[PDB]
Each structure stands twice: as C-alpha cells, then as structure tokens.
Amino acid sequence: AKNIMHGPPPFYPLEDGTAGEQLHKAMKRYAQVPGTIAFTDAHAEVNITYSEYFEMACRLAETMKRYGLGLQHHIAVCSENSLQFFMPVCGALFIGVGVAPTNDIYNERELYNSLSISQPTIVFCSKRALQKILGVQKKLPIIQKIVILDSREDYMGKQSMYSFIESHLPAGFNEYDYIPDSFDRETATALIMNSPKGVELTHKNICVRFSHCRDPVFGNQIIPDTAILTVIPFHHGFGMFTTLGYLTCGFRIVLMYRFEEELFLRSLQDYKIQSALLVPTLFSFFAKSTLVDKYDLSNLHEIASGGAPLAKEVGEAVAKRFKLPGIRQGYGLTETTSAIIITPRGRDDKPGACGKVVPFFSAKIVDLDTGKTLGVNQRGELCVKGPMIMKGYVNNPEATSALIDKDGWLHSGDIAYYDKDGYFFIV
C-alpha cells in the first residue's frame, strides 16, 4: 500500500460551507473593490466587473427562490461562451438548485436527450440557442420557463434576466444583505454535466476543486490583476471547473465565443494574459502556427487544458512556440469533477507526465486482468479515489457501478504508470 500514491495535505485547510457559500463569499469580497474585472468579451471588447456579477448572481438567486425553486429543482444553461453564462450558474449554486450546462451546438435529438436527463424547470439560453430550446420544450413539460441571457430587453416574447428579476424581486433587495442557503454539501446536487449520460456532481465535489484551484502548488496563486484567456466551452468539465475556480480567485476571465488565430494571439498580448486554456485539438493548431512570435507574450506563464491529457511531443512543440519551459498538464474526467492529477506549479522537468495526485485523492495502477495493484514504473489501468468523484450517473446505477467499485475506486479506462517521484504518465 506503499504502491498507492496519495496527494499531500492542501496548503490551506478545506473551507467549510456549500459551494454556493464559498463562491458567494469570495465574489462579495471582489465586488467591493471597484473596477475589478470578472469577465471580458474579446470579440465585443466589453468588461463586466465583480460588483456587477455579484449583484446579478444575488438577484437571480433570490428571484429563483421566490419563483419557487429549491433543492428538488434543476435549471439548464444553454449558450455559447459569453459574459452572462455564469450569472445563472452562481445564482443557482447560492440556493442549492442543480445546474445543467447544456452543449449549445447539440442538434435537436442530442439536446432533447440531455434535457430529458437533467429535467430543468427553467432554461436560461442565448438568442442563438432559443429556437432549438423552444422545440425541445414542446416535448418536455418540465420546462416551464425560458429566460434570455444576452438581451437587455424581452426577446421573442421571452423575459430577459432583468425582466425575470423585476417580476419577483422585492422592492429594496440589497445584494450585500443577501445570505446564500445552507444544506448538506455531501449530498446536494451542484451540477449535472454531460459525459450519453448525466454526471451528477455534489457541492462537496466543487468545494474540493475550490481547494485545489486556490492551492499554491496545485492551482494558481491569488495575485491581483491576474488575467486568463479561455476558449474552452463552459459546458465542458474542463471549462466549467477552471472558470468557476477563477472566480474564487478574483481573476479576469477573458473569453471568446469563437476561435480565431489573430484575435487569440492579440488578446494574449494586449490583455497581458498569464494563463491560456486550450482544447486538445487547439494544441495541435498552435504547433502549426508561426504567427505566435509576432506578438509580445512576455506576460504569459502558463498553458493548460483543465485536465485533458496531451501527447508529449505536441505539448513540447506548443511550449517551444510560446517560449515556455513546458505545458501545465493534468488528468481528469467529467466523472471526477476536474483534474485529479495536476503538474505542480512551476515544475517543467517531467514532459510527458500529467503530474501528481491532488490533495484528498489517491491513485493506483492495476493489472488489467486481475485488479492487482502494481508498483513503480509498471503499466496498468489507472484508478483514482477521492471526494471529487461524482455522486453517480443520473438514473443509471448500473453504469455507475460498472465505473466505480464498491471500495470507491473509479476505473478510468486509461493505461498509465507512475515514476519514482510520484509523477503519472498516460500511455
């Protein structure tokens, strides 16, 4: 059992409270420093500050509670990456209402299948997504309300966030007196994510990610005026749990609803970005790109994927283009909330490794035929155990049991080994 790798203790002890309570507390502090930027739309050039974001999140929270939503209800958010995407997400976490980030590029059948699993009472959607959501609403009576995200006025006969709020929020609502709900973080559904199944993640699951993201070895240091650029879809686990964590760190999250090479590189330079978050196939793109050295990227210290493992050689080619000593890798699955193996900050001598096991977690390598635990440098199936492991697949205890054994180990399906320094490598 010296052959099981364990993460170390977190730098800071695990904070109490639900995920909504932790997020509210951080956002409320950043809201009181005027001009602190939460999100920036790289296409439109519009910035939204933490005081704006905190105020909208508290108003949506109270509005949804007055409308009648509680722990037994869910909501969906279906939208391209945008400034408004996270408003209903934060608000719902405040009040213990499960949130379902729902791919906005799904076709009708796919969307129906996703929303059939999550059963949302309210869908928040963008203008682009409305027509398909209206189609699916005809087949899913649970969907009683649609609210438009990216509109300042009512659109196509649907209320905007502002008009929805106005319909329910009492006169004199003060966001600074608002208090998020408390409930059992171990069991309360925080998010339902897609993996074609629903992955139910709990508040405790997100609270542990919130430890890692603010950890000086396993996350990012909270340093004022840190900006990050992400082109990861907010409905992917890799995009949701990096972005949500950044809100707890008070960072400026620069977004793009569409990838374009020049806009991406210009944004990195002009916004003095410190970390850039890519999807795996954009690593391959950036290994081809020669435009990169026309830009001043002297502020950039990190390229990451949120836990999608990368081939060693593509990782090294990208790092070289961007004049960095390496990529910051990780390994996670939607079913593990986020990355449970992460490269320790500032360490770039293990190219090819996905990193070390995160605090609160254990990882082992097993023989594929036997289940037998293997030792150092020996290849087998990667299994992981810890408090970011999903509650289970929505409505599918058979698939849950096939993935996670009776001792709490999730069997990832990947082949891996670890080395003498405790670094893991996916084969």
Short mmCIF file of all heavy atoms in Angstrom, two decimals, residues 62-111:
data_model
loop_
_atom_site.label_atom_id
_atom_site.label_comp_id
_atom_site.label_asym_id
_atom_site.label_seq_id
_atom_site.Cartn_x
_atom_site.Cartn_y
_atom_site.Cartn_z
N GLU A 62 -32.18 35.13 -5.44
CA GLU A 62 -33.42 35.46 -4.75
C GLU A 62 -34.63 35.35 -5.65
O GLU A 62 -35.69 34.93 -5.20
CB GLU A 62 -33.34 36.89 -4.18
CG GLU A 62 -34.46 37.29 -3.25
CD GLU A 62 -34.57 36.42 -2.00
OE1 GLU A 62 -33.56 35.77 -1.57
OE2 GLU A 62 -35.69 36.36 -1.48
N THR A 63 -34.49 35.72 -6.92
CA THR A 63 -35.56 35.63 -7.88
C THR A 63 -36.00 34.20 -8.09
O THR A 63 -37.21 33.91 -8.09
CB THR A 63 -35.17 36.23 -9.22
OG1 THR A 63 -34.99 37.64 -9.08
CG2 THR A 63 -36.23 35.98 -10.30
N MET A 64 -35.04 33.29 -8.26
CA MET A 64 -35.38 31.89 -8.46
C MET A 64 -36.04 31.30 -7.19
O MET A 64 -36.92 30.43 -7.29
CB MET A 64 -34.16 31.07 -8.87
CG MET A 64 -33.73 31.32 -10.31
SD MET A 64 -32.40 30.23 -10.92
CE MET A 64 -30.95 31.05 -10.17
N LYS A 65 -35.62 31.75 -6.02
CA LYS A 65 -36.18 31.22 -4.76
C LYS A 65 -37.66 31.69 -4.65
O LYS A 65 -38.53 30.91 -4.33
CB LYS A 65 -35.34 31.70 -3.56
CG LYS A 65 -35.81 31.16 -2.26
CD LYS A 65 -35.08 31.72 -0.99
CE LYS A 65 -33.90 30.89 -0.54
NZ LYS A 65 -34.22 29.47 -0.29
N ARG A 66 -37.92 32.93 -5.03
CA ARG A 66 -39.28 33.50 -4.98
C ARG A 66 -40.17 32.87 -6.04
O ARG A 66 -41.33 32.68 -5.83
CB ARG A 66 -39.23 35.00 -5.22
CG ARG A 66 -38.34 35.72 -4.25
CD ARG A 66 -39.08 36.26 -3.13
NE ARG A 66 -38.21 36.88 -2.12
CZ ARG A 66 -38.69 37.54 -1.06
NH1 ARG A 66 -40.00 37.66 -0.89
NH2 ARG A 66 -37.87 38.09 -0.17
N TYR A 67 -39.59 32.58 -7.20
CA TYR A 67 -40.32 31.89 -8.24
C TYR A 67 -40.76 30.52 -7.76
O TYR A 67 -41.72 29.97 -8.29
CB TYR A 67 -39.42 31.79 -9.49
CG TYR A 67 -39.98 30.97 -10.64
CD1 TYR A 67 -40.77 31.55 -11.64
CD2 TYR A 67 -39.70 29.63 -10.72
CE1 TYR A 67 -41.26 30.78 -12.71
CE2 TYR A 67 -40.21 28.85 -11.78
CZ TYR A 67 -40.96 29.44 -12.76
OH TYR A 67 -41.42 28.62 -13.76
N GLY A 68 -40.01 29.93 -6.84
CA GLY A 68 -40.39 28.69 -6.17
C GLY A 68 -39.40 27.56 -6.29
O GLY A 68 -39.74 26.42 -5.96
N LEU A 69 -38.18 27.84 -6.74
CA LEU A 69 -37.21 26.80 -6.94
C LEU A 69 -36.48 26.51 -5.62
O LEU A 69 -36.16 27.42 -4.86
CB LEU A 69 -36.18 27.21 -8.00
CG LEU A 69 -36.34 26.82 -9.46
CD1 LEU A 69 -37.77 26.85 -9.98
CD2 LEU A 69 -35.31 27.55 -10.36
N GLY A 70 -36.21 25.23 -5.40
CA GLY A 70 -35.47 24.69 -4.27
C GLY A 70 -34.61 23.48 -4.68
O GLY A 70 -34.34 23.25 -5.89
N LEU A 71 -34.20 22.71 -3.67
CA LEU A 71 -33.28 21.58 -3.85
C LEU A 71 -33.79 20.47 -4.75
O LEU A 71 -33.00 19.68 -5.28
CB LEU A 71 -32.93 20.97 -2.49
CG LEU A 71 -31.69 21.52 -1.74
CD1 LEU A 71 -31.68 22.99 -1.77
CD2 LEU A 71 -31.69 21.01 -0.26
N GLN A 72 -35.10 20.40 -4.91
CA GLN A 72 -35.69 19.37 -5.75
C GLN A 72 -35.74 19.81 -7.21
O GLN A 72 -36.03 19.02 -8.08
CB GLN A 72 -37.10 19.02 -5.26
CG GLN A 72 -37.18 18.67 -3.79
CD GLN A 72 -36.10 17.73 -3.36
OE1 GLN A 72 -35.54 17.87 -2.28
NE2 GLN A 72 -35.76 16.78 -4.22
N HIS A 73 -35.42 21.05 -7.48
CA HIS A 73 -35.44 21.51 -8.86
C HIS A 73 -34.06 21.65 -9.50
O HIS A 73 -33.04 21.78 -8.82
CB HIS A 73 -36.13 22.84 -8.97
CG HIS A 73 -37.51 22.86 -8.41
ND1 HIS A 73 -37.78 23.27 -7.12
CD2 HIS A 73 -38.70 22.53 -8.96
CE1 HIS A 73 -39.08 23.18 -6.90
NE2 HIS A 73 -39.66 22.73 -8.00
N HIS A 74 -34.05 21.65 -10.82
CA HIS A 74 -32.86 21.94 -11.61
C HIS A 74 -33.11 23.10 -12.59
O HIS A 74 -34.24 23.43 -12.91
CB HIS A 74 -32.44 20.71 -12.42
CG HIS A 74 -32.02 19.54 -11.59
ND1 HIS A 74 -32.05 18.25 -12.06
CD2 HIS A 74 -31.59 19.46 -10.30
CE1 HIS A 74 -31.64 17.43 -11.12
NE2 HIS A 74 -31.37 18.14 -10.03
N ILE A 75 -32.02 23.70 -13.06
CA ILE A 75 -32.10 24.64 -14.15
C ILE A 75 -31.11 24.21 -15.21
O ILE A 75 -30.17 23.47 -14.92
CB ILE A 75 -31.81 26.10 -13.73
CG1 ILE A 75 -30.38 26.29 -13.17
CG2 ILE A 75 -32.89 26.61 -12.73
CD1 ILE A 75 -29.85 27.72 -13.35
N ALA A 76 -31.31 24.70 -16.45
CA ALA A 76 -30.31 24.48 -17.50
C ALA A 76 -29.77 25.84 -17.98
O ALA A 76 -30.48 26.85 -17.96
CB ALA A 76 -30.90 23.68 -18.68
N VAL A 77 -28.53 25.81 -18.47
CA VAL A 77 -27.91 26.95 -19.15
C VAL A 77 -27.39 26.44 -20.47
O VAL A 77 -26.54 25.52 -20.51
CB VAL A 77 -26.74 27.54 -18.32
CG1 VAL A 77 -26.22 28.86 -18.97
CG2 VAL A 77 -27.21 27.82 -16.89
N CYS A 78 -27.91 26.99 -21.56
CA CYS A 78 -27.56 26.58 -22.90
C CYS A 78 -27.16 27.80 -23.68
O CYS A 78 -28.01 28.62 -24.05
CB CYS A 78 -28.75 25.89 -23.56
SG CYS A 78 -28.40 25.19 -25.22
N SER A 79 -25.87 27.94 -23.94
CA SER A 79 -25.33 29.15 -24.53
C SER A 79 -23.89 28.98 -24.92
O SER A 79 -23.12 28.35 -24.21
CB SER A 79 -25.39 30.28 -23.51
OG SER A 79 -24.86 31.49 -24.05
N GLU A 80 -23.52 29.60 -26.01
CA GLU A 80 -22.12 29.85 -26.32
C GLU A 80 -21.44 30.60 -25.17
O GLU A 80 -22.11 31.26 -24.35
CB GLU A 80 -22.01 30.68 -27.64
CG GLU A 80 -22.55 32.16 -27.58
CD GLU A 80 -24.06 32.30 -27.86
OE1 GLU A 80 -24.78 31.28 -28.00
OE2 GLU A 80 -24.51 33.46 -28.00
N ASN A 81 -20.11 30.46 -25.07
CA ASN A 81 -19.40 31.19 -24.06
C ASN A 81 -19.77 32.67 -24.15
O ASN A 81 -19.73 33.24 -25.24
CB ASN A 81 -17.88 31.03 -24.20
CG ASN A 81 -17.39 29.69 -23.70
OD1 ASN A 81 -18.21 28.78 -23.49
ND2 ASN A 81 -16.03 29.53 -23.57
N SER A 82 -20.04 33.30 -23.00
CA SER A 82 -20.41 34.73 -23.01
C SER A 82 -20.24 35.33 -21.66
O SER A 82 -20.07 34.62 -20.63
CB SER A 82 -21.89 34.85 -23.37
OG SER A 82 -22.68 34.38 -22.28
N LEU A 83 -20.38 36.66 -21.61
CA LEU A 83 -20.32 37.39 -20.34
C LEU A 83 -21.39 36.97 -19.34
O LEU A 83 -21.19 37.14 -18.13
CB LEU A 83 -20.48 38.90 -20.57
CG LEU A 83 -19.39 39.66 -21.29
CD1 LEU A 83 -19.82 41.08 -21.39
CD2 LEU A 83 -17.97 39.51 -20.61
N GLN A 84 -22.55 36.48 -19.83
CA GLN A 84 -23.69 36.26 -18.94
C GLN A 84 -23.82 34.79 -18.47
O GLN A 84 -24.57 34.48 -17.57
CB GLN A 84 -24.98 36.66 -19.67
CG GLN A 84 -25.12 38.18 -20.01
CD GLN A 84 -24.41 38.59 -21.28
OE1 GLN A 84 -24.10 37.76 -22.12
NE2 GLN A 84 -24.13 39.89 -21.41
N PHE A 85 -23.13 33.89 -19.14
CA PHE A 85 -23.27 32.45 -18.93
C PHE A 85 -23.27 32.10 -17.45
O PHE A 85 -24.13 31.33 -16.98
CB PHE A 85 -22.14 31.70 -19.63
CG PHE A 85 -22.30 30.21 -19.62
CD1 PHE A 85 -22.61 29.53 -20.79
CD2 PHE A 85 -22.19 29.48 -18.45
CE1 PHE A 85 -22.82 28.18 -20.80
CE2 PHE A 85 -22.34 28.09 -18.46
CZ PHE A 85 -22.64 27.44 -19.64
N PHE A 86 -22.31 32.64 -16.73
CA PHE A 86 -22.17 32.26 -15.31
C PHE A 86 -23.14 32.90 -14.34
O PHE A 86 -23.20 32.50 -13.16
CB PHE A 86 -20.71 32.43 -14.82
CG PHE A 86 -19.86 31.19 -15.10
CD1 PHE A 86 -19.25 31.01 -16.32
CD2 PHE A 86 -19.76 30.18 -14.14
CE1 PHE A 86 -18.55 29.83 -16.58
CE2 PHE A 86 -19.07 29.03 -14.39
CZ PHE A 86 -18.43 28.87 -15.62
N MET A 87 -23.94 33.87 -14.78
CA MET A 87 -24.82 34.51 -13.85
C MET A 87 -25.83 33.54 -13.26
O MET A 87 -25.92 33.46 -12.06
CB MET A 87 -25.50 35.72 -14.44
CG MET A 87 -24.59 36.89 -14.60
SD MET A 87 -25.29 38.15 -15.66
CE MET A 87 -23.95 39.29 -15.84
N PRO A 88 -26.57 32.79 -14.08
CA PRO A 88 -27.47 31.83 -13.51
C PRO A 88 -26.75 30.68 -12.82
O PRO A 88 -27.29 30.11 -11.90
CB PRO A 88 -28.25 31.33 -14.70
CG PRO A 88 -27.39 31.62 -15.84
CD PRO A 88 -26.79 32.93 -15.52
N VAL A 89 -25.52 30.38 -13.20
CA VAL A 89 -24.80 29.29 -12.57
C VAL A 89 -24.51 29.63 -11.09
O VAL A 89 -24.79 28.80 -10.17
CB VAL A 89 -23.47 28.99 -13.28
CG1 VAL A 89 -22.72 27.88 -12.54
CG2 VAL A 89 -23.68 28.63 -14.78
N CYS A 90 -23.97 30.82 -10.85
CA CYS A 90 -23.67 31.30 -9.50
C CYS A 90 -24.92 31.42 -8.66
O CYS A 90 -24.94 30.97 -7.52
CB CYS A 90 -23.02 32.70 -9.54
SG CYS A 90 -21.36 32.75 -10.33
N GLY A 91 -25.95 32.05 -9.23
CA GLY A 91 -27.21 32.23 -8.53
C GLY A 91 -27.81 30.90 -8.05
O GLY A 91 -28.34 30.84 -6.93
N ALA A 92 -27.84 29.89 -8.92
CA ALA A 92 -28.36 28.53 -8.60
C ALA A 92 -27.51 27.84 -7.54
O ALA A 92 -28.06 27.18 -6.65
CB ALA A 92 -28.44 27.63 -9.85
N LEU A 93 -26.18 27.97 -7.62
CA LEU A 93 -25.35 27.40 -6.59
C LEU A 93 -25.65 28.05 -5.23
O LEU A 93 -25.61 27.38 -4.22
CB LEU A 93 -23.87 27.46 -6.91
CG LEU A 93 -23.38 26.58 -8.07
CD1 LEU A 93 -22.02 27.10 -8.52
CD2 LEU A 93 -23.28 25.08 -7.82
N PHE A 94 -25.89 29.36 -5.21
CA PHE A 94 -26.28 30.03 -3.97
C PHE A 94 -27.50 29.41 -3.23
O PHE A 94 -27.58 29.48 -2.01
CB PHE A 94 -26.56 31.52 -4.16
CG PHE A 94 -25.37 32.35 -4.57
CD1 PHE A 94 -25.56 33.69 -4.89
CD2 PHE A 94 -24.08 31.84 -4.65
CE1 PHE A 94 -24.50 34.47 -5.26
CE2 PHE A 94 -23.04 32.62 -5.06
CZ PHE A 94 -23.23 33.93 -5.37
N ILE A 95 -28.43 28.84 -3.97
CA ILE A 95 -29.67 28.40 -3.42
C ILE A 95 -29.82 26.89 -3.53
O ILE A 95 -30.88 26.41 -3.29
CB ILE A 95 -30.91 29.12 -4.04
CG1 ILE A 95 -30.99 28.96 -5.56
CG2 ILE A 95 -30.95 30.68 -3.66
CD1 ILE A 95 -32.38 29.30 -6.11
N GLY A 96 -28.77 26.16 -3.92
CA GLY A 96 -28.85 24.69 -3.97
C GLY A 96 -29.71 24.13 -5.08
O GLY A 96 -30.26 23.03 -4.97
N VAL A 97 -29.83 24.85 -6.18
CA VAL A 97 -30.60 24.34 -7.29
C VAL A 97 -29.60 23.77 -8.31
O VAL A 97 -28.72 24.49 -8.77
CB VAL A 97 -31.41 25.46 -7.91
CG1 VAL A 97 -31.84 25.10 -9.30
CG2 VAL A 97 -32.59 25.79 -6.99
N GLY A 98 -29.73 22.50 -8.67
CA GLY A 98 -28.77 21.89 -9.60
C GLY A 98 -28.73 22.57 -10.97
O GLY A 98 -29.79 22.90 -11.56
N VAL A 99 -27.52 22.77 -11.48
CA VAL A 99 -27.35 23.44 -12.78
C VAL A 99 -26.88 22.44 -13.83
O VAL A 99 -25.94 21.69 -13.59
CB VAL A 99 -26.34 24.62 -12.73
CG1 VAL A 99 -26.23 25.29 -14.11
CG2 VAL A 99 -26.73 25.61 -11.77
N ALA A 100 -27.49 22.49 -15.02
CA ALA A 100 -27.11 21.64 -16.17
C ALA A 100 -26.59 22.47 -17.34
O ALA A 100 -27.37 22.96 -18.14
CB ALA A 100 -28.38 20.79 -16.65
N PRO A 101 -25.26 22.64 -17.47
CA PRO A 101 -24.64 23.22 -18.63
C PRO A 101 -24.82 22.33 -19.81
O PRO A 101 -24.36 21.20 -19.82
CB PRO A 101 -23.18 23.25 -18.26
CG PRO A 101 -23.14 23.07 -16.85
CD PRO A 101 -24.24 22.20 -16.52
N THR A 102 -25.48 22.83 -20.82
CA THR A 102 -26.04 22.00 -21.88
C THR A 102 -25.43 22.48 -23.17
O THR A 102 -25.60 23.64 -23.53
CB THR A 102 -27.57 22.17 -21.90
OG1 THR A 102 -28.08 21.87 -20.57
CG2 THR A 102 -28.24 21.29 -22.96
N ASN A 103 -24.67 21.62 -23.83
CA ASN A 103 -24.00 21.97 -25.10
C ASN A 103 -24.88 22.76 -26.07
O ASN A 103 -25.91 22.27 -26.45
CB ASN A 103 -23.52 20.68 -25.77
CG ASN A 103 -22.46 20.92 -26.87
OD1 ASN A 103 -22.44 21.97 -27.51
ND2 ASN A 103 -21.57 19.95 -27.05
N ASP A 104 -24.47 23.96 -26.47
CA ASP A 104 -25.26 24.82 -27.39
C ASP A 104 -25.15 24.46 -28.89
O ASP A 104 -25.83 25.03 -29.72
CB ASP A 104 -24.83 26.26 -27.24
CG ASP A 104 -23.35 26.47 -27.47
OD1 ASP A 104 -22.54 25.76 -26.81
OD2 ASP A 104 -23.00 27.33 -28.32
N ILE A 105 -24.31 23.52 -29.22
CA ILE A 105 -24.11 23.12 -30.60
C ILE A 105 -24.71 21.70 -30.78
O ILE A 105 -24.61 21.12 -31.85
CB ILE A 105 -22.56 23.18 -30.94
CG1 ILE A 105 -22.02 24.63 -30.83
CG2 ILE A 105 -22.22 22.65 -32.34
CD1 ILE A 105 -22.91 25.76 -31.44
N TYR A 106 -25.35 21.15 -29.74
CA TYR A 106 -26.11 19.89 -29.91
C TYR A 106 -27.15 20.07 -31.00
O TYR A 106 -27.69 21.11 -31.14
CB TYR A 106 -26.90 19.50 -28.66
CG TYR A 106 -26.16 18.74 -27.58
CD1 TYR A 106 -26.66 18.76 -26.30
CD2 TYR A 106 -25.03 18.01 -27.83
CE1 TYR A 106 -26.09 18.08 -25.29
CE2 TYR A 106 -24.38 17.31 -26.78
CZ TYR A 106 -24.97 17.37 -25.50
OH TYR A 106 -24.49 16.73 -24.40
N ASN A 107 -27.44 19.02 -31.76
CA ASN A 107 -28.63 19.03 -32.59
C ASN A 107 -29.86 18.74 -31.71
O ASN A 107 -29.73 18.45 -30.51
CB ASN A 107 -28.51 18.03 -33.75
CG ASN A 107 -28.43 16.60 -33.27
OD1 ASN A 107 -28.98 16.25 -32.23
ND2 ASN A 107 -27.75 15.77 -34.04
N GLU A 108 -31.04 18.81 -32.32
CA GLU A 108 -32.30 18.69 -31.59
C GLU A 108 -32.41 17.40 -30.77
O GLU A 108 -32.81 17.40 -29.62
CB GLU A 108 -33.48 18.82 -32.58
CG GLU A 108 -33.62 20.22 -33.15
CD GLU A 108 -32.75 20.51 -34.42
OE1 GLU A 108 -31.74 19.81 -34.72
OE2 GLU A 108 -33.14 21.48 -35.14
N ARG A 109 -32.02 16.30 -31.35
CA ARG A 109 -32.14 15.00 -30.69
C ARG A 109 -31.21 14.91 -29.49
O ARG A 109 -31.57 14.44 -28.43
CB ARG A 109 -31.78 13.90 -31.69
CG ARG A 109 -31.68 12.48 -31.12
CD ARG A 109 -30.96 11.56 -32.14
NE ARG A 109 -29.84 12.22 -32.84
CZ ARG A 109 -28.56 12.03 -32.55
NH1 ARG A 109 -28.22 11.21 -31.56
NH2 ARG A 109 -27.62 12.66 -33.24
N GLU A 110 -29.99 15.39 -29.68
CA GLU A 110 -28.99 15.45 -28.63
C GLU A 110 -29.42 16.36 -27.44
O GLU A 110 -29.24 16.02 -26.27
CB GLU A 110 -27.69 15.98 -29.24
CG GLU A 110 -26.95 14.98 -30.15
CD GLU A 110 -25.78 15.59 -30.94
OE1 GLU A 110 -25.70 16.83 -31.12
OE2 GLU A 110 -24.94 14.80 -31.39
N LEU A 111 -29.99 17.50 -27.76
CA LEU A 111 -30.47 18.45 -26.79
C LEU A 111 -31.64 17.84 -25.98
O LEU A 111 -31.63 17.86 -24.75
CB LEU A 111 -30.88 19.71 -27.53
CG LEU A 111 -31.21 20.98 -26.77
CD1 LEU A 111 -30.02 21.49 -25.93
CD2 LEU A 111 -31.63 22.06 -27.77
#
